[PDB]
Structure formats: structure tokens, C-alpha cells
Structure 1
Amino acid sequence: ADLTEYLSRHYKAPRMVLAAAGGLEHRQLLDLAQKHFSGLSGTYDEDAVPTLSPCRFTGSQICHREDGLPLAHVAIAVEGPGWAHPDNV
């Protein structure tokens, strides 16, 4: 029930992209997508459309102390820019 509901919600046309790369003609890919993928639904039931709420970054630490393992692994980071920000470059 959870898997099928997760599928029915999230796996849909406006939320999806069909990519291709190699020796192939854009017209042909579009014909194949029109012939096979146009069967997908195109909007919602007027709700159930989940949109991303922003996530709170918290400066904090987690220290899984385990001397039995041979080498310590450390990962330190500050809050990132997000996909959109030119600063990324």
C-alpha cells in the first residue's frame, strides 16, 4: 500500500524527464515518448501535490566513538548554496 501510493503520487509526467544521448534523432525520441510515455497522468487530484519545504541546517556534531575500527573517518561541512546559486561555481 505504501509503495503503490508513493509510486502513484511521485512517479508522474510533469515531475519526470526523459533524457537521451548518443547517435539518435531528437524527432524520433519525441515520437517514442509520445507513443509510449503520453499514457502518464498530467496533474493531480487537486491535492497530494507535495512541494519541497526548505530544510533547516543545524551546526552540530555526531561522534560515533568506535576504537575497534582501524581508521577514523571525519566529515565536516557548512551550509551549502543550493542548486540555483551562481556561487556554486
Structure 2
Amino acid sequence: ADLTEYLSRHYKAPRMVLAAAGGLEHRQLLDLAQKHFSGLSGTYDEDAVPTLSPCRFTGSQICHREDGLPLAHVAIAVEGPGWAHPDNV
């Protein structure tokens, strides 16, 4: 019930993309999309559809001290901007 609720809420047509690359016409990709995907959100556009909300970055430390392991792993990061931002390049 947890799993089907997740599926119901999230696997909805405006939120998913049929992608292809290779030896194909776009026309037949479009044809097969109407053939096999068209029963998804023809009247299923309903309920709180579903805003993400910003995540507060902190500036903090987690240190799992284990001297039994032979090499140290360290990852360090500042807060980056999202997908959208020109600053990424």
C-alpha cells in the first residue's frame, strides 16, 4: 500500500519523459507513445501535484572514526547552485 501510493502520486505523465537515441524516426517514437502510454493522465490530473521545496544547506561535520580501516575517506563541499544556474559552466 505504501508502494502503490508512491506509484499513484509520482508516476504521472507530465512528470515523465520517453527518451530515445539511435536508428529511429521521431514519428514512430511519437506513434508508439500514443499506442502504449496514453492511458496515464487523460483524467488522472488530480491531488497535491507535488511541490518540492528548497533544502537548507548547513555547514557542518560528520566524522565516523574507524581506525580499523586502512585508508581515510574525506568529502568536502560548499553549497552549489541548482541545475538551472549559468554559474555551473
TM over 0.5: yes
> If the length of structure 1 is used for normalisation, what is the TM-score?
0.94
Per the alignment, residue 80 of structure 1 pairs with 80
5+ residue gaps, structure 2:
none
Aligned length: 89
What root-mean-square deviation, in Å, do the aligned CA atoms of Structure 1 and Structure 2 show?
Answer: 1.4
Query: Structure 1 residues 42 and 10, CA, compared in 2 at 3 Å: closer, same or farther?
Result: farther
Runs of 4+ in 1 over 2 A off after TM superposition: 42-48
Q: 1:13–1:41: 8 Å Cα contact kept in structure 2?
A: yes
> Tell me, which stretches of 5 or more residues in structure 1 are unaligned?
none
Q: Secondary structure at the match of 1:35?
A: helix
TM-score under structure 2 length normalisation: 0.94
Q: Partner of 1:34 in structure 2?
A: 34
Give me the identity figure in percent.
100
SS in 2 for 1:64: strand
